[PDB]
């Protein structure tokens, strides 16, 4: 093999470097540098990434996930719900665990909302998906370690977060409960995510605990691909065939 | 029965069953092309040594 | 409802140690989001922070303290407590126990205890 | 580090009157200034941990308001509960750190 | 209207089938005109069971 | 609690149309599975359905009315409207405006305003 | 299209009395029929939503009975609140026609 | 795309995806090998023979 990472087909791969999927695209603080999205062929990762989730959690069908990222030649991140929208809602929040040059800060592309003033009004909104074409939405649900926690941080705690559209159907809780402390948290953070179809609408409804999305990503190439794991960079090449020692440019 | 149904949400395994197909298919492909190709040869051979 | 205890009052001469020890009750001081801290309280003058802990270990100690202060956690005991290395007359004041709320969005002292009073003098 | 600003030192008040306290961030601190209520000899307790949210327990007259570098600390109705030196902190930054501290006197 | 219940459940089982779930209450897009859904399951049950 | 209100009363002419505007409070005309009517009652008469705009903007209206009136819904001021055109002595009623409940098993009129009073005449 | 027939036009009762109101549809209607009650000078009011069960806020005293052709609304026991004219309602077609309507007077 | 993403719950899974990548191993190592030293014998002997 040629021992460097090529273009395939002409088409660069995604450069996630020392970032995962979810951090990528949830906005790790620390993955700022991978917004440059170019177009790609496959998916470059390293293995074992160290810039996933900042904020303890776990990703649902987050395989799934991955392997329809590889054939995402290219997105376009889309602004669908501007933080400044929930006015009743405070959407300053974050965490010391995302802390940026040590003020705590949050995942770029999605708004913690938690309790204002006195109370926590149920969060609504929606999106009409008049982009042209399909998009990824991503949100999540907080899970505090404690009943404390979820009173300070949205007041109800009988609380429910509430997502669907003509195919999804989804409903979840928090679960308050103790667990072993993770980057210094004992809470956690799930993710979900959907494809809302043209012309769909998706609706968010919550009573507390919603990471709303401010920002969805539209996918308009549709091809096939896979993820490959390796310590290397992208070189100025073109390959027929990928391996992650390097490329092969055979006919045998 | 070829062909399978598979969920949206399936996908990673969708593609299992279509990996097994198109494996398949491109050894019996292979196969029956190089069979092919060395019977007949080995045919007109025993024809002319006849 | 959790309570902080801070053991009582003394005067200690210069350059000897200072040592309080904070009795936490009513839940455990390794089970959820928080941290301990000392804040201090010349008369007169502003609340000062002088170092945290965390429930998980972890600790931060102020620019002018971190030199001479230590702050440990003993899980066993439900306690904490402050040792003040070679102590001045500058460091006369109340000493309080605080129990910060380490929720991302949140941060602030929710619980306080009551306040010791520690002399530095000759 | 970021200093924080607080004034007035002191201003007296009759019971029923509007009290505003104002305190500033030399640099934004977003969200993150809490309040806290002190009584001479008593260690301080909190009033509000974000700004707008109280705490409970804490009258519905107190209700702080503001942004980034400047936020106000309101009693509506001044109470004779109320006669206190308040303290604004910010805990954005690794250091946290407290105003001077306001001290509402009877007027 | 329909249930006068609010807090409801729907509670199936057999020899080896445990299930329950809740309605789920919230606003949809219409679809053939109607915002609720109906969710179907099913099951087998075996002979002599019930 | 939903209510719905009526603009007000007033006289037309034949030949002329008829406008009345309900607005609609306490929730969206878009958001659950109801649909909007207006019904007529002619002094001494039955109630009359005119016709009915459901929130997903399908319509239908009655046989003797269908040539003449129009029925349609404005989300943006959460409004809906009635529109009679060529109107005659015959109309003249009191119009009512109306929520119906869409729920497959249950079809009923749940919500009415007071109703608005037209007169047709020379 | 199914025409509805209700009867009596009228009937007078004193309070207290048990009074029945019949509904008839030409086609059955299945359990699709409705009953309001009218006060003179008002917007009517649902009493019935399907045949038998009633709206929240209905007097007890309220309770239909019937299926296909053949419905009645009964009043238990008369009160000086139900001096009404009721209504039934056919939503089983595409046309939701009422029917004549039925006025209970004082005796 | 050769390498598929799955879950810790999935090993049983993981495990089939990973028996068709060895049982085409075999199938096209064996082939190929067989492959290769029959035309060899048959190269050289139609050499041989020419
Ligand atoms: C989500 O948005 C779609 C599209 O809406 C249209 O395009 C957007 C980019 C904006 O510019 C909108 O302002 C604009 O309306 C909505 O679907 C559309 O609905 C209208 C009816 O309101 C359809 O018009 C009719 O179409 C039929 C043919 O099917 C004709 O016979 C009629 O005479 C009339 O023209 C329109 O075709 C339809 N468009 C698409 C692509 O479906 C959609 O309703 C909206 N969703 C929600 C919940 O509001
Ligand atoms: C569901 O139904 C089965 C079958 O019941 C029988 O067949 C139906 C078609 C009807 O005609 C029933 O009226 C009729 O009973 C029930 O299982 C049966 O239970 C009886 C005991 O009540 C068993 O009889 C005994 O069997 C043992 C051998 O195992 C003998 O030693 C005894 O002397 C006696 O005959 C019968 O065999 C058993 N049949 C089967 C096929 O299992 C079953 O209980 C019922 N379920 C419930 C919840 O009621
Ligand atoms: C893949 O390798 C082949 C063979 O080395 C490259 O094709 C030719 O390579 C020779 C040098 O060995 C050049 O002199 C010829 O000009 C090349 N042919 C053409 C049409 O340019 C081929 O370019 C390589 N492909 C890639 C993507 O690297």
Known sequence: ?252 | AVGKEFSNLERRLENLNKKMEDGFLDVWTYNAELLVLMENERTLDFHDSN | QVQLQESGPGLVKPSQTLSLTCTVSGGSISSGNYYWSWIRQPAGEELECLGRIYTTGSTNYSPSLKSRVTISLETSKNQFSLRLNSVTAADTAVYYCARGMDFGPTDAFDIWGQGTMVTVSS | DIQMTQSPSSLSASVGDRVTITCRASQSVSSYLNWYQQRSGKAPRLLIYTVTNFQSGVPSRFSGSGSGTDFTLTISSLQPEDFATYYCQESYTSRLTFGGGTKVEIK
């Open chain 1, 1 to 252: 093999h040629n021992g460097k990472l090529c273009k395939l087909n002409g088409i660069p791969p995604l450069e996630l470097g020392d970032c995962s999927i979810a951090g990528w695209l949830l906005g790790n603080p620390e993955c700022d540098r991978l917004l440059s999205v170019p177009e790609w062929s496959y998916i470059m990762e390293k293995e074992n990434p160290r810039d996933g989730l900042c904020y303890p959690g776990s990703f649902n069908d987050y395989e799934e996930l991955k392997h329809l990222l590889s054939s995402v030649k290219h997105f376009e991140k889309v602004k669908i719900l501007p933080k400044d929208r929930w006015t009743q809602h405070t959407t300053t929040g974050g965490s010391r665990a995302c802390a940026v040059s040590g003020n705590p800060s949050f995942f770029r592309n999605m708004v913690w909302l938690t309790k204002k003033g006195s109370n926590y009004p149920v969060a609504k909104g929606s999106y009409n998906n008049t982009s042209g074409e399909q998009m990824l939405i991503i949100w999540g649900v907080h899970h505090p370690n404690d009943e404390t926690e979820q009173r300070t941080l949205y007041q109800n705690v009988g609380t429910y977060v509430s997502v669907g559209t003509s195919t999804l159907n989804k409903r979840s809780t928090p679960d308050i409960a103790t667990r072993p402390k993770v980057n210094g948290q004992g809470g956690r953070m799930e993710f979900s995510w959907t494809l809302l179809d043209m012309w769909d609408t998706i609706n968010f409804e919550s009573t507390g605990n919603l990471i709303a999305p401010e920002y969805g990503f539209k996918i308009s190439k549709r091809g096939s691909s896979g993820i490959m794991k390796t310590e290397g960079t992208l070189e100025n090449c073109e390959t027929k065939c990928q391996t992650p020692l390097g490329a092969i440019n055979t006919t045998l």
